[PDB]
Design a protein around this ligand. Structure first.
Ligand code: HEC
Ligand code: SF4
Ligand code: SF4
Ligand code: F3S
Lengths: 395, 49, 56, 456, 174, 170
């Protein structure tokens, strides 16, 4: 264990609340110039750090189902990402406040004259209505936090009492049906917060495209977090070069899954061009959003498809984070392509509120992520795979 | 020993001289029965009454 | 007959030499055959190969 | 060790490299007139299924494609429900062969050849159906991009043209990754022959292998790349056999979660067939020390982990059929729950998301008479999913004046019930002539258990 | 007409320690001949990997860019068809057919490029005529050197193989 | 050039079925026996659809003359593996019978189901039952004279469609 772990994780916690709090003081003071532009730019920044928190919960449950030496290096980093979901329940309140205000900035089914004219939206008012939108929203959070708090109180038990199948039986008893009621609580949450911004446009697979990107962000965050903790010499274990090729196998095999669920979402909508399915990709392939579409094929898939094929720049640490940071800067563009063209559908524009709210929720997320890393000893030293991590370090 | 030394001549030309000739047979049958002007009889002087 | 419908200019002759059997194509078939295509209002390669031309 | 107690669940008693090679080299090399029973009585039951297969095809070509019972509303029937079912079966035969080899997992080792070969014979039984459901089957070469004296090529926007491109890539790399796996294995059956006319048979199937580190290193860098090329293939193949509904504008067909939910149902129905085939390959061939019950505890967990993604698939496609305010997808929910074929969707919720939800408990996973009934309710049930997807979306659609029924005739049953003949004609030819367990890989698993006991 | 001086071994724990000992003895032309792949034999022999994955990628880029350019040449240059009102350069609906041509030509360079990199369509190797090579693909492990190196005679080698732990050092012919 | 469209005045259609039987006499459409109409395999390029709106004792009966609408963004064409269903530049839907290999996917994606597949050898069916191949390629000689010489008398496994009478267009 390094001595400079808890001060540098304390410093990164303190500097991220000031970075992610001033940028939120710049956001709400920037909200007063243009009111609707804030909530158009806030919910874009919400989905990037909600999915980076929920994927930190979702990979944590795959880490408990399987015996990987990968993931033991991530288990205290996924648990540091899964319990920022209490922050994504309190930063959901600006999205919850707009549904209560009579502004109809965020969700256009809050408008009583959109419901009264569009009959397609008026038949979704059993599901899309603000006394039941918010009641569904706190149902997701008590299932997201409750499946993160139970996976913390039983994992902080492990470094307290010890490993047995009394405890590892509890992980697989939760995370077995956890992913069931995590996917199903996300395919009711992405049709609440993400798909219902385009309320005339239904879809299957629209939460699944987020699910395959929750795996990109939290394996990309798996390699970025084990890079800064390696470059500053703060990791309690030297990284096995065989198991970084496992994290690069996961980063590569979830770029390809993401480009298979986003393209077959497009391949179906483009083939049968039904006018209740095409307005999404018609607003996202016209008026400048065509440029972000061609980026999502080449800069998101095909540029990290070729560099993530060799063992070089997949087995080396310094050339995998050159992909994992680049995959963050290409997923930020993607969540700007998923969420933002629901607002101002004809034409592409980007505000400074788009990239000062991503810093605002980001430093708030990276402060709470760094707050939970001082809680854990970063190794899970009473685990059953840590004798395998004692191997693969002395060759 | 099974498969004595003479079989190395056989196994070499079965993938280096056979498969270019079998694909030249199947390339010539593809020409003669799907591409030629013989199977659609040109220049043949069809007999009248 | 698809290469001749997609590019009729390398085979189209004047109407006054259609029933003349001794008509050989000139060395300047193009720029004359293309001249005859715009003169005879011969339709483009898009409209001429779409199996209602043939294949009813 | 926590890793050594994983690998000891896969073998069991005292086993060396010879005792492992002997119990797989006694399924093969046990000669005819000494060959044990069960294989003769099964190979002549499969012949009566193959003579039901070859007679239903000789009928089908002669009198036509309209002895099936396919209507004009529902014009895709048992020729396509069984085709996506058979393609669905062989897909978890390559999750076992290729996707688990990415994960460096050692419980896929003894389930390998009984899933590589089970892929191929669920593709050779499958791949006849895209060639015989056409009304003019002698022109299925027109779906190939070849140059001819016609200026015509295939369309390459239809998802049945990609079915040509998926299966004729799936059929050829299944028989190239199972034959590459049999290159170092039929060299072991060659050296255990002591009979030169069966030694020359396995001395020519295996090309001359010798082992060797310059050949063993080239083998696994051509195996895991093939296991890395067959893993986006089968997530695409049964996605491409899923696009040929989801490309179409039909209300039950045009859903966009068809590509991951079909391949989930392929690694749901497929693991049910590997379980339905390996429980009678321990009680009949004495493989209790290679196909130990932890392999079924893990094949049941992955079948459960795949059966929830189709449990998600039935609830998503019933949510977004309601979440869409279409009258045609409102009617889709009220034609699977009500209507003339409501029994099919309720024998689907029972057989897929009610009966195999006992897979959570180990009580119905380690117990093979309970895992068999669960997996036999998935092969019948995932046939009914592909019936609900194909027929119940076709037989009632947009216009009410084109509502059909599709009660199948005998030649739709005799081709499907005859198709199990051609599966078990080739499966019983695979069991007798070829090893059912990859010997060289389970020799490495025996070596991996010894090299972790020697780390103490 | 002399190819052998090949030593039988009991288990591969004593083979790779002897195969890396042959790397310390200057012999550059030697093999392993095991029934199973052992971790660290090509590192012990000194094979330094193979150029075979670049043959798989070189044929995968020829199948992906060869099938995508096939359906584009069909739909734009050869016979462009208004089929369904869909555009001529349909860049979707060409990807599920240029992906399966990428998998096909890669695996055609993965099986037929492995049995072309290894000389496997080759019966009668000069190692099969050994007194116990029937056990070579079942239980035993056979460190074998050849006569392609300039530092192999029958002596200088048989005493070196007995400086290892062998079971039966046997000289096999061609 | 020559954009071909059709307007069907549904207010004046009395469901006389004279347009069903005149498409049959013009486009060589085969008759299908009683046993294969019950299986929904009638060959009729145009159909009239009663719909019975209202009370079950005194309803209003409405006709929809449903033929091939010749869709510009035709979904029946994009699902044809061998491209046996393409468009003109005139705009109408060309169902070419000699290219049809018989994959009935066009009929599934056709939302109106105005595609009609030859399932058996539908030819002279009230004079020979269509479940035999003893007379599959042998035809009645006197029935050959009633056929229009401009429309393909179709084979066993090809699909049909209302072609706007393209032999009268051309
Ligand atoms: C006139 C220039 C034509 C066009 C617009 C199309 N075809 Fe086409 N076709 C033409 C001719 C002279 C023949 C006879 C060729 C021969 O004798 O081999 C054909 C034939 C065909 C076939 C062959 C049928 C068979 O061999 O059983 C097919 C499949 C075919 N034609 C298809 C086809 C398609 C799909 C077209 C789409 C636009 C098309 N044809 C146009 C002449 C013409
Ligand atoms: S459209 Fe047909 S049914 Fe209607 S009046 Fe004319 S011929 Fe009679
Ligand atoms: S048959 Fe149906 S889908 Fe095809 S063009 Fe006519 S109306 Fe459109
Ligand atoms: S899709 Fe294609 S080939 Fe025949 S029946 Fe339907 S046309």
């Amino acid at each position: 264990e390094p001595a400079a772990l808890r001060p540098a994780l304390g410093r990164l916690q303190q500097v991220a609340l000031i970075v992610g709090g001033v940028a939120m003081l710049l956001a709400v003071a920037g909200a007063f110039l243009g009111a609707a532009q804030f909530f158009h730019s806030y919910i874009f920044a919400y989905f990037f750090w909600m999915a980076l928190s929920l994927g930190g919960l979702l990979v944590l449950m795959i880490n408990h189902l399987t015996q990987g030496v990968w993931g033991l290096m991530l288990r205290r980093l996924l648990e540091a990402a899964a319990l920022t979901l209490p922050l994504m329940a309190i930063l959901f309140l600006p999205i919850a406040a707009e549904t209560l205000m009579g502004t109809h900035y965020l969700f256009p089914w809050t408008n009583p004259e959109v419901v009264a004219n569009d009959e397609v939206v008026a038949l979704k008012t059993p599901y899309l209505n603000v006394p039941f939108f918010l009641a569904r929203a706190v149902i997701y959070f008590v299932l997201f936090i409750g499946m993160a708090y139970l996976l913390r109180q039983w994992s902080l038990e492990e470094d307290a009492k010890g490993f047995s199948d009394d405890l590892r039986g509890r992980f697989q008893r939760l995370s077995g049906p956890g992913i069931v009621v995590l996917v199903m609580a996300w395919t009711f949450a992405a049709t609440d917060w993400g798909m219902s911004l385009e309320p005339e446009w239904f879809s299957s697979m629209y939460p699944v495209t987020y699910i395959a990107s929750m795996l990109i962000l939290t394996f990309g965050g798996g390699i970025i977090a084990l890079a800064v903790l390696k470059s500053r010499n703060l990791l309690p274990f030297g990284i096995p070069v065989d198991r970084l090729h496992d994290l690069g196998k996961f980063l590569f095999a979830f770029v390809a899954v993401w480009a298979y669920v986003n393209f077959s979402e497009y391949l179906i909508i483009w083939s049968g061009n039904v006018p209740e399915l095409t307005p999404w990709h018609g607003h996202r392939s016209a008026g400048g959003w065509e440029i972000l579409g061609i980026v999502m094929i080449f800069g998101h898939f095909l540029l990290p498809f070729m560099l993530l094929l060799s063992r070089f720049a997949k087995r080396r640490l310094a050339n995998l984070t050159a992909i994992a940071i680049y995959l963050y800067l290409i997923e930020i563009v993607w969540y700007f392509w998923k969420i933002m063209p629901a607002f101002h559908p004809d034409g592409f524009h980007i505000h400074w509120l788009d990239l000062v709210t991503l810093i605002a929720i980001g430093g708030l997320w990276l402060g709470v992520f760094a707050w939970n890393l001082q809680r854990a000893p970063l190794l899970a030293p009473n685990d059953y795979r840590v004798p395998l991590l004692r191997r693969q370090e002395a060759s | 020993q099974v498969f004595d030394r003479r079989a190395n001549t056989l196994a070499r030309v079965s993938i280096f001289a056979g498969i270019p000739l079998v694909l030249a047979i199947l390339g010539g049958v593809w020409w003669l029965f799907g591409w030629s002007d013989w199977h659609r009889d040109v220049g043949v002087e069809i007999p009248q009454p | 007959c698809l290469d001749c419908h997609r590019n009729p200019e390398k085979y189209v002759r004047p109407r006054e030499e259609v029933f003349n059997m001794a008509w050989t194509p000139p060395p300047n078939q193009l720029e004359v055959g293309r001249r005859l295509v715009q003169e005879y209002e011969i339709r483009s390669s898009w409209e001429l190969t779409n199996c209602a031309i043939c294949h009813r | 060790s926590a890793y050594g107690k994983m690998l000891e669940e896969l073998l069991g008693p005292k086993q060396t490299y010879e005792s492992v090679t002997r119990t797989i080299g006694d399924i093969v090399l046990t000669p005819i007139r000494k060959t044990p029973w069960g294989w003769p009585v099964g190979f002549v039951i499969a012949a009566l299924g193959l003579l039901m297969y070859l007679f239903s095809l000789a009928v089908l070509f002669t009198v036509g494609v309209g002895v099936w019972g396919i209507n004009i509303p529902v014009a895709w029937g048992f020729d396509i429900i069984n085709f996506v079912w058979w393609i669905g079966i062989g897909h978890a035969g390559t999750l076992i062969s290729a996707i688990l080899l990415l994960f460096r997992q050692d419980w896929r080792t003894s389930i390998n050849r009984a899933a590589e070969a089970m892929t191929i014979f669920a593709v050779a039984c499958a791949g006849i159906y895209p060639l015989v459901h056409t009304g003019r089957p002698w022109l299925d070469y027109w779906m190939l991009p070849y140059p001819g004296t016609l200026g015509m090529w295939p369309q390459f926007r239809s998802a049945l043209e990609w079915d040509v491109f998926a299966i004729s890539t799936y059929a050829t790399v299944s028989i190239l990754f199972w034959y590459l796996g049999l290159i170092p294995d039929l060299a072991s059956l060659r050296d255990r022959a002591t009979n030169i006319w069966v030694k020359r048979f396995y001395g020519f199937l295996a090309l001359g292998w010798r082992g060797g580190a310059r050949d063993w290193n080239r083998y696994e860098v051509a195996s895991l790349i093939l296991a890395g090329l067959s893993t986006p293939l089968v997530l695409s193949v049964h996605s491409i056999i899923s696009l040929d509904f989801a490309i179409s504008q039909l209300p039950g067909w045009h859903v966009t979660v068809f590509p991951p939910y079909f391949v989930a149902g392929a690694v749901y129905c497929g693991f049910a067939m590997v379980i339905l085939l390996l429980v009678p390959l321990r009680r009949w061939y004495k493989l209790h020390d290679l196909i130990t019950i932890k392999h079924f505890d893990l094949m049941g967990k992955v079948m459960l982990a795949s059966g929830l993604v189709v449990a998600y698939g039935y609830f998503a496609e019933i949510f977004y059929a309601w979440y869409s305010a279409n009258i045609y997808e409102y009617f889709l929910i009220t034609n699977r729950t009500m209507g003339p074929y409501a029994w099919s969707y309720w024998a689907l919720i029972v057989l897929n998301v009610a009966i195999p939800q006992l897979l959570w408990f180990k009580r119905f996973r380690v117990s093979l008479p309970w895992l068999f009934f669960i997996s036999i309710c998935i092969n019948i049930g995932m046939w009914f999913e592909r019936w609900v997807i194909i027929v119940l979306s076709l037989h009632r659609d947009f216009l009410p004046s084109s509502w059909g029924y599709y009660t199948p005739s005998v030649w739709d049953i005799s081709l499907y019930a005859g198709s199990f003949g051609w599966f078990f004609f080739l499966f019983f030819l695979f069991i007798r002539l070829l090893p059912a367990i990859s010997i060289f890989e389970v020799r490495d698993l025996v070596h991996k258990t010894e090299t972790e006991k020697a780390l103490a | 007409t002399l190819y052998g001086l090949m030593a039988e071994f009991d288990d591969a724990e004593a083979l790779l320690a002897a195969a890396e000992k042959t790397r310390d003895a200057g012999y550059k032309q030697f093999e392993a001949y095991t029934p199973m792949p052992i971790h660290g034999l090509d590192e012990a022999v000194g094979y330094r990997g193979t150029r075979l994955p670049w043959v798989i990628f070189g044929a995968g880029l020829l199948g992906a860019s060869g099938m995508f350019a096939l359906q584009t040449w069909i739909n734009l240059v050869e016979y462009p068809l208004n089929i369904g009102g869909r555009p001529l350069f349909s860049w979707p609906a060409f990807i599920p057919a240029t992906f399966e041509g990428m998998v096909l030509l890669s695996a055609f360079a993965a099986v037929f490029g492995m049995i072309a990199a290894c000389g496997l369509p080759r019966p009668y190797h000069p190692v099969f005529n050994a007194p116990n090579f029937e056990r070579a693909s079942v239980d035993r492990f056979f460190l074998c050197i050849e006569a392609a190196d300039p530092k192999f005679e029958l002596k200088q080698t048989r005493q070196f193989l007995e400086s290892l732990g062998p079971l039966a050092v046997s000289t096999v012919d061609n | 050039g020559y954009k071909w469209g059709m307007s069907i005045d549904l207010n004046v259609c009395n469901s006389c079925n004279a347009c069903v039987v005149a498409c049959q006499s013009e486009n060589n459409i085969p008759v299908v026996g009683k046993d294969e109409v019950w299986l929904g395999r009638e060959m009729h390029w145009i159909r009239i659809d009663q719909y019975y709106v209202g009370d079950e004792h005194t309803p209003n009966v409405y006709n929809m003359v449903m033929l091939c609408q010749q869709c510009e963004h035709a979904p029946c064409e994009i699902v044809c593996p061998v491209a046996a269903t393409v468009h003109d530049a005139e705009g109408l839907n060309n169902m070419v019978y000699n290219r049809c290999v018989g994959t009935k996917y066009c009929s599934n994606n056709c939302p109106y189901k105005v595609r009609r597949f030859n399932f058996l050898q539908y030819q002279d069916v009230p004079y020979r039952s269509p479940i035999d191949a003893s007379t599959e390629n042998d035809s009645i000689p006197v029935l050959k004279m009633m056929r229009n010489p401009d429309v393909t008398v179709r084979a066993r496994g090809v699909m049909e469609k209302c072609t706007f009478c393209v032999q009268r267009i051309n």
